[PDB]
Amino acid sequence: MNIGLLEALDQLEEEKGISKEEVIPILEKALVSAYRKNFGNSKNVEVVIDRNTGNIKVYQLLEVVEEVEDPATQISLEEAKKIDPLAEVGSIVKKELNVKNFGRIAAQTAKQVLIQRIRELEKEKQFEKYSELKGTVTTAEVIRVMGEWADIRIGKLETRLPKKEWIPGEEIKAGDLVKVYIIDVVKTTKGPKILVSRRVPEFVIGLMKLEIPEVENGIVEIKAIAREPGVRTKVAVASNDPNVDPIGACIGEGGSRIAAILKELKGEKLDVLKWSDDPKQLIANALAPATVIEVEILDKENKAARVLVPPTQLSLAIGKGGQNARLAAKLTGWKIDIKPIMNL
Amino acid sequence: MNIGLLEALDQLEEEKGISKEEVIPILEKALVSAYRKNFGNSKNVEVVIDRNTGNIKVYQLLEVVEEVEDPATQISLEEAKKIDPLAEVGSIVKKELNVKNFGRIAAQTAKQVLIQRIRELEKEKQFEKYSELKGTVTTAEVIRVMGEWADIRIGKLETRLPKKEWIPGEEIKAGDLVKVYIIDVVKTTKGPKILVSRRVPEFVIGLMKLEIPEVENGIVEIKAIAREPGVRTKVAVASNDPNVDPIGACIGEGGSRIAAILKELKGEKLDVLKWSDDPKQLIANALAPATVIEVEILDKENKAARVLVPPTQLSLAIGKGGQNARLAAKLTGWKIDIKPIMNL
């Protein structure tokens, strides 16, 4: 609307690289709308900016006709030709207008446009976002829960945490800070969205990586995990460095570390056990708590086994509703059958 | 140099999206050099194109001085002011020149520039190239060997195949078509380069994926591989679908498939064996050719074993220079000791 300087200078006045190869065509469009809501929709106008100074200049479009009935539009052939020598009836001629004000300045909207094109690059666009730290755990701020999900923020991004991906039975509330595992980050037609969960098995691995330097390190390796969300998780670990006790690094100084882990799990148990290449020792480590007398392989190629336990440890080994033996079986890939002994 | 139309029209005349937000500044630069080698270096000139029609227009720069001694450069204050009212001694004034020819047209160079900016996008730039099919095997054309490496082409790209990554002992020659495994593709300051090899273990897996549908499928899974480049490779396979014989799909109809595999390996052997979850059966499958009487575990947690074989199979099991037992040990992760039997 106004040619009051502006432009060029405001073009990247510190920060970011914005090619006006697109900033202006959008500004023009907006400026036409700007010119509109700041005078009237009586005149059909075009806003042009042929680079250089740019200088906002508007033209009133007029249809060349045989007889003028609406002077705001329409123009005679004779009058049209003075503007464009080649004009014929049916042609459109463009008459340049001036400027004005009427209180405030409309031209300032180029800002809105300018900024809006900034918010778009704020989304990395074209791809998704470097915020694609898929496979990790991060903290998020809970901004109101909606029943079936919770809106939460991570950095300058917000995303839904479906109640289906919450730890079963836990309770979340606005303000709470929660740890979440990042399954993926997808660039949608509304900005990048981070897919999150607190219930998949990798969430537990991520918490371990966070609280246990040796796990982040590789010094302690996670060889297997079995998780029943909200109930319990068994994880088998191995130490690469024969001088590092894997159990000890996971548990921490005085049970710290695991305490931090268990806190985020809002009540879900975690059995940290030692991995073994001998399936009989692995299976026995996996059934803790409970002491096994011995493991009998019932099938080497199909991995099935019969586990013998002292009576007084029968129901402990199976666990409430079979949870202990169930998790042990899942963790090991072996079919397990628990049987009480009979000492002679 | 010349304002003979040109520009705009040639701007993206079918194919590609090229923002002249950079095409012109480079054209200008080149045009200055173009104007130079097409007249003389007597006049210091600037070529400007303020978008719009663009129209190539040149200006001769003149230093405003107290006394003119070189009229091709230098201009008096009085004369300078007629051109730029604000000119002072020490200022630079720009005098617009016209056009010409002298045989052919110089302005055509905008092409070279135009194209050159095309060849740059041909490299995907910014990142590396979608040609990043890292982890696969592809065919390449051998364009001359240089002793320590071979220059070969893949698509419209060329890359070096170091002799160190050739199958030991093989011989390559210009014209040959060779299979190569893609380790990586890196965007260098000279275009993307594909890192290749024919000697790493994944090269064998890639050939298997190529010749064996079930492997590409997942129906047959590669569980372990041990390779001594140029000598022999043992690979252990398993079938997911209990109705598919894994050995049979790898070998193919009438030994075809494996024949194709062995051909690319220019002489290197390939023992395709069946994977087993029972280490005793795996170890026995791994020592083929040779028949094992039995496998005795010497250490369950440290995976060491003593393998018993009939005499008449002792040296066969160890293999030439220990190659058979060596590959079997590497493939299985187990330490193996071969011993002849003694039937009563």
Burial annotation A229-257 (CB, 10 A radius, 16+ → b, else e) = bbbbbbbbbebeeeeeebeebbbbeeeeb
CA distance A86 to chain B (A): 19
Provide, as residue numbers in chain A, all residues whose Cβ is less than 8 Å from the Cβ of B21.
19-21
Contacts of A247 (CB under 8 A, 6+ apart): A237, A272, A273, A274
Q: From CA B325, how far away is CA B320, in angstroms rounded?
A: 9
CA B85 to mean position of chain CA atoms = 59
CATH class of A1-125: alpha beta
Q: Does domain B135-197 have CATH number 2.40.50.140?
A: yes
What pairs with residue A270 in β-bridges?
A233
For the beta sheet containing A335-340, the strands, ordered from the edge strand earlier in sequence to the opposite edge, are A294-299, A304-309, A335-340
Resolution (A): 2.1
Tokens of A157: 């991004």
Contacts of A112 (CB under 8 A, 6+ apart): A30
CA A270 to mean position of chain CA atoms = 27
Other residues' Cβ atoms within 10 Å of the Cβ of residue A48: 15
The residue in chain A having the minimum alpha-carbon distance to the alpha carbon of residue B22 is: A19
Q: Which of A19, A50, A277 faces B19 most closely, judged by CB atoms? A: A19
Contacts of B97 (CB under 8 A, 6+ apart): B43, B45, B58, B59, B60
Same topology for domains A135-197 and A198-276, yes or no? no
Provide, as residue numbers in chain B, all residues whose Cβ is less than 8 Å from the Cβ of A52.
50-52
Nearest C-alpha neighbor of A16 from the set A128, A125, A157, A108: A125
Pick the CATH number of B198-276 from 3.30.300.20, 3.40.1080.10, 3.40.50.920, 3.30.565.10: 3.30.300.20
Angle between helix axes A279-286 and A323-332 (nearest 10 degrees) is 150
Provide, as residue numbers in chain B, all residues whose Cβ is less than 8 Å from the Cβ of A281.
300-301
Tokens of B251: 């070998």
Could you give the residue ranges of the DSSP H alpha helices within chain A? 20-36, 77-83, 110-121, 201-211, 213-217, 246-251, 258-264, 279-286, 314-318, 323-332
3-state secondary structure of A221: strand
Domain range annotation of chain A: 1-125, 135-197, 198-276, 277-344
Residue B301 one-letter amino acid = E
3-state secondary structure of A100: coil
Provide, as residue numbers in chain A, all residues whose Cβ is less than 8 Å from the Cβ of B280.
300
Chain A residues interacting with chain B (CB cutoff of 8 angstroms): 19-21, 50-52, 276-278, 280-281, 300-303
Cα atoms in the 13 Å half-sphere on the side-chain side of A265: 27
Interchain CB distance below 8 Å, A280 and B300: yes
CA distance A21 to chain B (A): 6
Provide, as residue numbers in chain B, all residues whose Cβ is less than 8 Å from the Cβ of A303.
277
Three-state helix/strand/coil letters over chain B: CCCCCCCCCCCCCCCCCCCHHHHHHHHHHHHHHHHHCCCCCCCCEEEECCCCCCCCEEEEEEEEECCCCCCCCCEEHHHHHHHCCCCCCCCEEEEECCCCCCCCCCHHHHHHHHHHHHHHHCCCCCCCCCCCCCCCEEEEEEEEECCCEEEEEECCEEEEEEHHHCCCCCCCCCCCEEEEEEEEEEEECCEEEEEEECCCHHHHHHHHHHHCHHHHHCCEEEEEEEEECCCEEEEEEEECCCCCCHHHHHHCCCCCCHHHHHHHCCCCEEEEEECCCCHHHHHHHHCCCCCCCEEEEEECCCCEEEEEECCCCHHHHHCHHHHHHHHHHHHHCCEEEEEECCCC
Provide, as residue numbers in chain A, all residues whose Cβ is less than 8 Å from the Cβ of B51.
50-52
Q: From CA B20, how far away is CA B22, in angstroms rounded?
A: 5
Nearest C-alpha neighbor of B38 from the set B103, B130, B127, B97: B103
Q: Which of A21, A277, A300 faces B19 most closely, judged by CB atoms? A: A21
Other residues' Cβ atoms within 10 Å of the Cβ of residue A309: 22
Tokens of B307: 């393998």
Interchain CB distance below 8 Å, B19 and A20: no
Phi, psi of B315 (to 5 degrees): -70, -25
Interchain CB distance below 8 Å, A301 and B278: yes
Tell me the fold of B277-344.
GMP Synthetase; Chain A, domain 3 (3.30.300)
Chain B residues interacting with chain A (CB cutoff of 8 angstroms): 19-21, 50-52, 276-278, 280-281, 300-303
In residues, how long is chain B? 344
How far apart are the two ends of chain B, measured CA to CA in Å?
Answer: 102
Angle at A237 between CA A236 and CA A241, to 5 degrees: 160
> Please, are residues B72 and B4 in contact by the beta-carbon 8 Å criterion?
no
Q: From CA A93, how far away is CA A234, in angstroms rounded?
A: 79
Nearest C-alpha neighbor of A229 from the set A265, A262, A177: A265
Tokens of B74: 């230098």
Phi, psi of A55 (to 5 degrees): 30, 110
> Please, are residues A250 and A272 in contact by the beta-carbon 8 Å criterion?
yes
Q: From CA B151, how far away is CA A256, in angstroms rounded?
A: 58
Pairing mode, strands B137-145 and B177-188: antiparallel
What pairs with residue A296 in β-bridges?
A306
Cα atoms in the 13 Å half-sphere on the side-chain side of A274: 15
Tell me the Cα Rg of chain A.
Answer: 35
3-state secondary structure of A75: strand
Q: Which of B51, B277, B301 faces A281 most closely, judged by CB atoms? A: B301
